[PDB]
Design a binder for this molecule. Structure first.
Ligand SMILES: C=C1[C@H](O)CC(=C/C=C2\CCC[C@]3(C)[C@@H]([C@H](C)CC#C[C@H](O)C[C@]45C[C@H]6C[C@H](C[C@H](C6)C4)C5)CC[C@@H]23)C[C@H]1O
Lengths: 11, 240
């Protein structure tokens, strides 16, 4: 499903 | 008796929590306003509070020593599964047994059972959460113990979907040993009595809370009218 927002918050 | 590395872990976690948890709750003014009188009048506000909290939990997690060194997929699995549990844990800081509510600085940002009921929850589902908060508050945790507990919750090697369980376990073990040593070295009796065991039991209690509250999330969000009131991050992290 991909988690673009979560991924960005982890950067 | 805390090793140099253990003191470092604690120092890092305290700094991480302080930068992701504002005890003044100033940002709450940016949320859609709470409405106390679609009968789910508090859904917009609590959805925003939870979405905001998810962002902060992720911010805390990324600072846990070693977490960012796990694969991105495992980081995602760990956060999706622990998010609601960590929000419950961190919320204990605002929770008060005075009147069984989460007091965030003002009447407008003071949430009780009725408020949660106005976000879709049945009173039956709310009760166990209140009981959990009371039990946790009574442990009178040092902030050091509080941040270690949240970190341990996040890096749990048994979450379904985790690929490198051994790596996740390696981090959790370092955190667990740090917590056990901290309690024995810095927590005076009688508050220290079986404290590690009691704390880990709270993590077990959270699995049950996660299961029941996640079922509620799925039921609530299944209705388009309700999902429309949520946020993009809530839908992504909790499901959509
Ligand atoms: C900055 C902080 C302050 O201490 C204030 C906080 C308080 C926490 C509270 C008080 C209000 C009710 C809270 C959200 C509890 C909620 C209702 C338990 C749950 C659940 C479902 O799976 C998710 C979900 C269902 C619906 C729609 C979305 C927002 C809200 C209502 C929660 C997602 C858990 C922690 C509680 C959160 C903390 O992060």
């Amino acid at each position: 499903k991909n988690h673009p927002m979560l991924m960005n918050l982890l950067k | 008796k805390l090793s140099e590395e253990q003191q470092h872990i604690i120092a890092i976690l305290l700094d991480a929590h302080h930068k992701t948890y504002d005890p003044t709750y100033a940002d709450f003014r940016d949320f859609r306003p709470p409405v106390r009188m679609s009968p789910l009048s508090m859904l917009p506000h609590l959805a925003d509070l939870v979405s905001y909290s998810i962002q902060k939990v992720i911010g805390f997690a990324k600072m846990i020593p070693g977490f960012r060194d796990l694969t991105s997929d495992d980081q995602i699995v760990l956060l999706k599964s622990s998010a609601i549990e960590v929000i419950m844990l961190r919320s204990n800081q605002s929770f008060t047994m005075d009147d069984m509510s989460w007091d965030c600085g003002s009447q407008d940002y003071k949430y009780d059972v009725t408020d949660v009921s106005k976000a879709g929850h049945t009173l039956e589902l709310i009760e166990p959460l209140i009981k959990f908060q009371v039990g946790l508050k009574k442990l009178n945790l040092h902030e050091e113990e509080h941040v270690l507990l949240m970190a341990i919750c996040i890096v749990s090697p048994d979450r379904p979907g985790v690929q490198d369980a051994k790596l996740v376990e390696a981090i959790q073990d370092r955190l667990s040993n740090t917590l056990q040593t901290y309690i024995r070295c810095r927590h005076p009796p009688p508050g220290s009595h079986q404290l590690y065991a009691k704390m880990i039991q709270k993590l077990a209690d959270l699995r049950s809370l996660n299961e029941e509250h996640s079922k509620q999330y799925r039921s609530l969000s299944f209705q388009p009218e309700n999902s429309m009131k949520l946020t993009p991050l809530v839908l992504e992290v909790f499901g959509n």
